[PDB]
Design an enzyme around this catalytic site. Structure first.
Site, PDB file in Angstrom:
ATOM      1  N   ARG A  60       0.850  -1.185   0.000  1.00 53.53           N
ATOM      2  CA  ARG A  60       0.000   0.000   0.000  1.00 53.53           C
ATOM      3  C   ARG A  60       0.887   1.236   0.000  1.00 53.53           C
ATOM      4  O   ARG A  60       1.564   1.521   0.992  1.00 53.53           O
ATOM      5  CB  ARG A  60      -0.937  -0.007   1.210  1.00 53.53           C
ATOM      6  CG  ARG A  60      -1.756   1.252   1.312  1.00 53.53           C
ATOM      7  CD  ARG A  60      -2.692   1.196   2.502  1.00 53.53           C
ATOM      8  NE  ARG A  60      -3.694   0.154   2.339  1.00 53.53           N
ATOM      9  CZ  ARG A  60      -4.467  -0.294   3.318  1.00 53.53           C
ATOM     10  NH1 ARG A  60      -4.349   0.169   4.558  1.00 53.53           N
ATOM     11  NH2 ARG A  60      -5.386  -1.217   3.043  1.00 53.53           N
ATOM     12  N   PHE A  98       1.158  10.669   1.577  1.00 53.86           N
ATOM     13  CA  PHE A  98       0.809  10.178   2.902  1.00 53.86           C
ATOM     14  C   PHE A  98       1.804   9.136   3.423  1.00 53.86           C
ATOM     15  O   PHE A  98       2.519   9.412   4.395  1.00 53.86           O
ATOM     16  CB  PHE A  98      -0.620   9.607   2.895  1.00 53.86           C
ATOM     17  CG  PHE A  98      -1.687  10.660   2.720  1.00 53.86           C
ATOM     18  CD1 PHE A  98      -2.165  11.366   3.808  1.00 53.86           C
ATOM     19  CD2 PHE A  98      -2.196  10.955   1.461  1.00 53.86           C
ATOM     20  CE1 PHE A  98      -3.125  12.343   3.651  1.00 53.86           C
ATOM     21  CE2 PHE A  98      -3.161  11.938   1.300  1.00 53.86           C
ATOM     22  CZ  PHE A  98      -3.630  12.624   2.402  1.00 53.86           C
ATOM     23  N   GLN A 158       3.329   1.572   3.100  1.00 54.75           N
ATOM     24  CA  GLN A 158       3.023   0.559   4.108  1.00 54.75           C
ATOM     25  C   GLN A 158       3.414  -0.817   3.604  1.00 54.75           C
ATOM     26  O   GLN A 158       3.150  -1.158   2.446  1.00 54.75           O
ATOM     27  CB  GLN A 158       1.542   0.603   4.450  1.00 54.75           C
ATOM     28  CG  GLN A 158       1.047  -0.454   5.473  1.00 54.75           C
ATOM     29  CD  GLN A 158      -0.423  -0.282   5.768  1.00 54.75           C
ATOM     30  OE1 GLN A 158      -0.960   0.795   5.543  1.00 54.75           O
ATOM     31  NE2 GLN A 158      -1.086  -1.332   6.279  1.00 54.75           N
ATOM     32  N   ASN A 192      -2.201  -1.202  12.281  1.00 57.98           N
ATOM     33  CA  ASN A 192      -2.966  -2.050  13.189  1.00 57.98           C
ATOM     34  C   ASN A 192      -4.402  -2.154  12.703  1.00 57.98           C
ATOM     35  O   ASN A 192      -4.804  -1.502  11.739  1.00 57.98           O
ATOM     36  CB  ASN A 192      -2.890  -1.546  14.646  1.00 57.98           C
ATOM     37  CG  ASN A 192      -3.512  -0.191  14.852  1.00 57.98           C
ATOM     38  OD1 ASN A 192      -4.653   0.057  14.468  1.00 57.98           O
ATOM     39  ND2 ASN A 192      -2.768   0.700  15.502  1.00 57.98           N
ATOM     40  N   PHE A 249       4.258   1.370   8.660  1.00 54.21           N
ATOM     41  CA  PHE A 249       4.223   2.349   7.586  1.00 54.21           C
ATOM     42  C   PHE A 249       5.290   3.394   7.829  1.00 54.21           C
ATOM     43  O   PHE A 249       5.684   3.645   8.977  1.00 54.21           O
ATOM     44  CB  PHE A 249       2.836   3.008   7.399  1.00 54.21           C
ATOM     45  CG  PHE A 249       2.312   3.758   8.610  1.00 54.21           C
ATOM     46  CD1 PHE A 249       1.848   3.061   9.717  1.00 54.21           C
ATOM     47  CD2 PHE A 249       2.274   5.147   8.622  1.00 54.21           C
ATOM     48  CE1 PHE A 249       1.353   3.757  10.849  1.00 54.21           C
ATOM     49  CE2 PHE A 249       1.782   5.870   9.740  1.00 54.21           C
ATOM     50  CZ  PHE A 249       1.311   5.160  10.845  1.00 54.21           C
ATOM     51  N   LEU A 271      -3.240  10.307  13.230  1.00 58.11           N
ATOM     52  CA  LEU A 271      -2.872   8.972  13.671  1.00 58.11           C
ATOM     53  C   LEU A 271      -2.223   8.964  15.055  1.00 58.11           C
ATOM     54  O   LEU A 271      -2.043   7.886  15.632  1.00 58.11           O
ATOM     55  CB  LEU A 271      -1.929   8.329  12.633  1.00 58.11           C
ATOM     56  CG  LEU A 271      -2.459   8.300  11.196  1.00 58.11           C
ATOM     57  CD1 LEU A 271      -1.399   7.704  10.267  1.00 58.11           C
ATOM     58  CD2 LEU A 271      -3.761   7.517  11.107  1.00 58.11           C
ATOM     59  N   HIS A 299      -1.649   4.894  16.435  1.00 52.84           N
ATOM     60  CA  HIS A 299      -0.565   4.068  15.945  1.00 52.84           C
ATOM     61  C   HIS A 299       0.693   4.366  16.730  1.00 52.84           C
ATOM     62  O   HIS A 299       1.007   5.530  16.970  1.00 52.84           O
ATOM     63  CB  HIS A 299      -0.343   4.346  14.459  1.00 52.84           C
ATOM     64  CG  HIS A 299      -1.542   4.024  13.635  1.00 52.84           C
ATOM     65  ND1 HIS A 299      -1.678   2.824  12.979  1.00 52.84           N
ATOM     66  CD2 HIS A 299      -2.701   4.696  13.441  1.00 52.84           C
ATOM     67  CE1 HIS A 299      -2.856   2.786  12.382  1.00 52.84           C
ATOM     68  NE2 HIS A 299      -3.497   3.905  12.651  1.00 52.84           N
TER      69      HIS A 299
HETATM   70  C1  LIG Z   1     -11.186   8.324   3.530  1.00 52.83           C
HETATM   71  C2  LIG Z   1     -10.052   7.846   2.669  1.00 52.83           C
HETATM   72  N1  LIG Z   1      -8.917   7.463   3.505  1.00 52.83           N
HETATM   73  C3  LIG Z   1      -7.795   8.212   3.815  1.00 52.83           C
HETATM   74  C4  LIG Z   1      -7.564   9.579   3.338  1.00 52.83           C
HETATM   75  C5  LIG Z   1      -7.548  10.610   4.275  1.00 52.83           C
HETATM   76  C6  LIG Z   1      -7.303  11.907   3.856  1.00 52.83           C
HETATM   77  N2  LIG Z   1      -7.303  12.955   4.760  1.00 52.83           N
HETATM   78  C7  LIG Z   1      -7.363  12.706   6.205  1.00 52.83           C
HETATM   79  C8  LIG Z   1      -6.638  13.754   7.016  1.00 52.83           C
HETATM   80  N3  LIG Z   1      -7.103  15.087   6.649  1.00 52.83           N
HETATM   81  C9  LIG Z   1      -6.516  16.093   7.534  1.00 52.83           C
HETATM   82  C10 LIG Z   1      -6.720  15.321   5.260  1.00 52.83           C
HETATM   83  C11 LIG Z   1      -7.425  14.357   4.331  1.00 52.83           C
HETATM   84  C12 LIG Z   1      -7.107  12.139   2.502  1.00 52.83           C
HETATM   85  N4  LIG Z   1      -7.122  11.154   1.586  1.00 52.83           N
HETATM   86  C13 LIG Z   1      -7.343   9.892   1.977  1.00 52.83           C
HETATM   87  C14 LIG Z   1      -7.328   8.844   0.876  1.00 52.83           C
HETATM   88  C15 LIG Z   1      -6.113   9.056  -0.001  1.00 52.83           C
HETATM   89  O1  LIG Z   1      -8.497   9.032   0.079  1.00 52.83           O
HETATM   90  C16 LIG Z   1      -8.704   8.006  -0.879  1.00 52.83           C
HETATM   91  C17 LIG Z   1      -6.995   7.485   4.695  1.00 52.83           C
HETATM   92  C18 LIG Z   1      -7.662   6.244   4.931  1.00 52.83           C
HETATM   93  C19 LIG Z   1      -7.354   5.107   5.689  1.00 52.83           C
HETATM   94  C20 LIG Z   1      -8.240   4.035   5.692  1.00 52.83           C
HETATM   95  C21 LIG Z   1      -9.409   4.093   4.936  1.00 52.83           C
HETATM   96  C22 LIG Z   1      -9.739   5.189   4.168  1.00 52.83           C
HETATM   97  C23 LIG Z   1      -8.857   6.265   4.189  1.00 52.83           C
HETATM   98  C24 LIG Z   1      -7.925   2.820   6.468  1.00 52.83           C
HETATM   99  C25 LIG Z   1      -8.477   1.590   6.350  1.00 52.83           C
HETATM  100  S1  LIG Z   1      -7.607   0.469   7.305  1.00 52.83           S
HETATM  101  C26 LIG Z   1      -6.668   1.769   7.953  1.00 52.83           C
HETATM  102  N5  LIG Z   1      -6.939   2.936   7.443  1.00 52.83           N
HETATM  103  C27 LIG Z   1      -5.608   1.560   8.989  1.00 52.83           C
HETATM  104  C28 LIG Z   1      -4.540   0.571   8.496  1.00 52.83           C
HETATM  105  N6  LIG Z   1      -4.862  -0.801   8.847  1.00 52.83           N
HETATM  106  C29 LIG Z   1      -4.400  -1.838   8.131  1.00 52.83           C
HETATM  107  O2  LIG Z   1      -3.919  -1.706   7.009  1.00 52.83           O
HETATM  108  C30 LIG Z   1      -4.414  -3.152   8.804  1.00 52.83           C
HETATM  109  C31 LIG Z   1      -4.288  -4.368   7.929  1.00 52.83           C
HETATM  110  C32 LIG Z   1      -3.138  -3.983   8.784  1.00 52.83           C
HETATM  111  C33 LIG Z   1      -2.738  -4.827   9.974  1.00 52.83           C
HETATM  112  C34 LIG Z   1      -3.180   1.005   9.013  1.00 52.83           C
HETATM  113  O3  LIG Z   1      -2.727   0.595  10.076  1.00 52.83           O
HETATM  114  N7  LIG Z   1      -2.485   1.931   8.280  1.00 52.83           N
HETATM  115  C35 LIG Z   1      -1.243   2.579   8.733  1.00 52.83           C
HETATM  116  C36 LIG Z   1      -1.542   4.057   8.880  1.00 52.83           C
HETATM  117  C37 LIG Z   1      -2.072   4.589   7.552  1.00 52.83           C
HETATM  118  C38 LIG Z   1      -3.280   3.778   7.055  1.00 52.83           C
HETATM  119  N8  LIG Z   1      -2.987   2.335   7.021  1.00 52.83           N
HETATM  120  C39 LIG Z   1      -3.676   4.226   5.671  1.00 52.83           C
HETATM  121  O4  LIG Z   1      -3.657   3.517   4.693  1.00 52.83           O
HETATM  122  O5  LIG Z   1      -4.040   5.513   5.654  1.00 52.83           O
HETATM  123  C40 LIG Z   1      -4.313   6.055   4.329  1.00 52.83           C
HETATM  124  C41 LIG Z   1      -4.436   7.565   4.515  1.00 52.83           C
HETATM  125  C42 LIG Z   1      -4.440   8.243   3.142  1.00 52.83           C
HETATM  126  C43 LIG Z   1      -3.242   8.089   5.315  1.00 52.83           C
HETATM  127  C44 LIG Z   1      -5.698   7.925   5.313  1.00 52.83           C
END
Ligand code: A1AHB
Ligand code: GNP
Ligand code: MG
Lengths: 170, 163
Positions: free
Chosen positions: B54, B59, B62, B101, B112, B121, B125
């Protein structure tokens, strides 16, 4: 060409939004934890004799990003509102999804289908009447599904299309 | 002193370069040790050969799923999962290394690397390290990602260990 329908699958995390969509698209089920960021799919089907193209948006249940939903709710034509029948909190979360959709689209008449998923499981904490009553109060259909057994999977997506059809001729 | 580990990153099997990390054993010893041991493979399993599944430009990158190689797996040296050690350290900017997590107390092996500040976060995290050398390698990995994180080439940890 065939009519395209913009379907959006919403609901709390872990209720089975992705498992339902991947059953519809790929006709298989795996019991792994793969939390969604955002995924889109296309599939052509026949519904009530009419061929159409499903454009399915599989959204994130991840609760911390609840302020990120307005745009896909404006774009979507119909909403599959999913909870799991063994998780009462996911059933309570449904109301907030519906209120958010109605608010964002500024309308009481948004095509939706209430879906109670995981009906293959023995640990049911939300009764059928409980969900039927809610769907009746919303004016929308209720369908019970299992992404694992495929029970009701086609029915849920197809019914949502029927609900969008009834709205676009209104 | 805080231990250092390295990743040798490859793109479709072709070498890209080395990233090294400082691990904050002084603040989060149990989480740092999990990552250190997985980077050496000393328990018979670990990061070597696994991929970054990922990558989301703007951002983070991962990876760490060495049991299923698709983002649904991973395991710690303490069992499948272990608790959140503390949340002393914050996601302050690019290069922060932090645990992925599935909710409270579900740390495994997935991790990540931040390519920007991700302060929402904080307190969810566990931050446990930072890129020391080769942040330009991480910047270079970003173009193989996308809005939902699917990668357009296979980005792998071809080798890893302790320095
Ligand atoms: C709304 C759309 N969206 C977005 C998002 C958020 C923003 N902003 C938020 C903050 N403001 C101030 C500005 C705008 C803008 N653009 C998007 C994306 C690009 O729009 C498509 C995120 C996100 C995360 C999840 C679901 C939807 C989500 C998600 C779904 S599971 C999860 N997080 C946590 C993830 N668990 C797992 O993998 C488990 C399987 C393992 C064990 C996890 O530990 N990590 C590590 C930390 C990062 C996280 N993954 C991840 O991938 O973060 C993606 C990120 C882009 C950082 C956040
Ligand atoms: N028994 C059973 N398990 C199901 C069913 N639907 C999904 N699951 C399981 O429940 C878990 C969560 O499913 P998933 O479809 O990933 O849920 P999600 O709603 O997409 N979660 P997210 O919003 O994070 O993307 C997985 O382990 C999946 O196998 C079902 O009908 N029956
Ligand atoms: Mg999902």
């Amino acid at each position: 060409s065939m009519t395209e329908y913009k379907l959006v699958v919403v609901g709390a995390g872990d209720v089975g939004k992705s498992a339902l969509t991947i059953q519809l698209i790929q006709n298989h089920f795996v019991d792994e934890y793969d939390p969604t960021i955002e995924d889109s799919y296309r599939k052509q089907v026949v519904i009530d004799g009419e061929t159409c193209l499903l454009d399915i948006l599989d959204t994130a249940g991840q609760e911390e990003y609840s302020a990120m939903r307005d745009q896909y709710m404006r774009t979507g034509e119909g909403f599959l509102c999913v909870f799991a029948i063994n998780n009462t909190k996911s059933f309570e979360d449904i109301h907030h999804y519906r209120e958010q959709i109605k608010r964002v689209k500024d309308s009481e008449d948004v095509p939706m289908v209430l879906v109670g998923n995981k009906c293959d499981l023995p640990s049911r904490t939300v009764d059928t009447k409980q969900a039927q009553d809610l769907a009746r109060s919303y004016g929308i259909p209720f369908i019970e599904t299992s992404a694992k057994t495929r029970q009701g999977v086609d029915d849920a997506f197809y019914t949502l299309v029927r609900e969008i059809r009834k709205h676009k001729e209104k | 002193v805080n231990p250092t580990v390295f990743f040798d990153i490859a793109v479709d099997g072709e070498p890209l370069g080395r990233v090294s990390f400082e691990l904050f054993a002084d603040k989060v010893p149990k989480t740092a040790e999990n990552f250190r041991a997985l980077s050496t493979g000393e328990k018979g399993f670990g990061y070597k050969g696994s991929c970054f599944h990922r990558i989301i430009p703007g951002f983070m990158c991962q990876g760490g799923d060495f049991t299923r190689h698709n983002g649904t797996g991973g395991k710690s040296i303490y069992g499948e999962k272990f608790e959140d050690e503390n949340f002393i350290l914050k996601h302050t900017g690019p290069g922060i290394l932090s645990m992925a997590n599935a909710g409270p107390n579900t740390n495994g092996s997935q991790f990540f690397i931040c390519t920007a500040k991700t302060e929402w976060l904080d307190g969810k995290h566990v931050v446990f390290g930072k890129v020391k050398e080769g942040m330009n390698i991480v910047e270079a990995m970003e173009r193989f990602g996308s809005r939902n994180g699917k990668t357009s080439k296979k980005i792998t940890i071809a080798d890893c260990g302790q320095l």
